[PDB]
Structure formats: structure tokens, C-alpha cells
Design a binder for this molecule. Structure first.
Ligand code: FES
Ligand code: FES
Lengths: 64, 67
């Protein structure tokens, strides 16, 4: 079954690049659940996904 | 439907941290499909998943300029 239900479905492979030199924040979270409204950033939508499905997914956190 | 089938299912929420200071490469791919054998790194397993399911997932690429 699908992982990504709704993000950029016209794109055959969704890849996001992060320019580390330009990170504003000392802690930044990136989505690994494909539900975030701020994708590729994590907005906490994983929590709802985990509650609905019994899953245990969470973000990748970059630290300065 | 679950996204993560096999990674640390005993862990209530799988979170990975990257310290930017430790990134060795100019380009490093991190997994967003939960199929990589090198998770949290991407090993290209997303391509098999996309072919099998009709999905369109891919990695997060961290780009670091050569000093
Ligand atoms: S919103 Fe997707 S991992 Fe947090
Ligand atoms: S192996 Fe999961 S995004 Fe590449």
C-alpha cells in the first residue's frame, strides 16, 4: 500500500533538497510521514497519523 | 494503513537526529519511505516501493557546501 496519499502526485518521485548553510533554526524537523501541511517540514501531523493507524513514525531532526 | 512496517516497532515514535557538524558528505540522502536497510539513510529502496505500489516517494537530500 501507498505511503504518500496526496503530495505532488504529478511528480513521479518527490525529492527535497535542504541547503544546510541556510538553516535559520538550531533545531529543524523534517517530515517522514507525508502528511505535513508544511512538507517537507514536520508540523506534528505524524501524531494524528500514528493515532489513526497505530503507527510509530516521526521526523528527522537537524541540529546546528 | 501503516507507513512503517518494520523499523523499531517497539518504539512509540521513531525520531532520528542529525548533528549538522557530523555530516561528512556534500550530499547525503535520508529515507522518507521506511524501507531502507540503512535507515535513517536512504539506500534506494524507495524505488522498489514506488514500482510495486505506484507511489512517488523519495528521500530528503542534505546538501552541505565544501568549505
Ligand atoms: S508531520 Fe510528518 S513526520 Fe511530523
Ligand atoms: S530508501 Fe527510503 S527514501 Fe530512499
Amino acid at each position: 500500500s501507498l505511503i504518500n496519499l496526496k503530495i505532488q502526485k504529478e511528480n513521479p518521485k518527490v525529492v527535497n533538497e535542504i541547503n544546510i548553510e541556510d538553516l535559520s533554526l538550531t533545531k529543524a524537523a523534517y517530515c517522514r510521514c507525508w502528511r505535513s501541511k508544511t512538507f517537507p517540514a514536520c508540523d506534528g501531523s505524524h501524531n494524528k497519523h500514528n493515532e489513526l493507524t497505530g503507527d510509530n513514525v516521526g521526523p528527522l531532526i537537524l541540529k546546528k
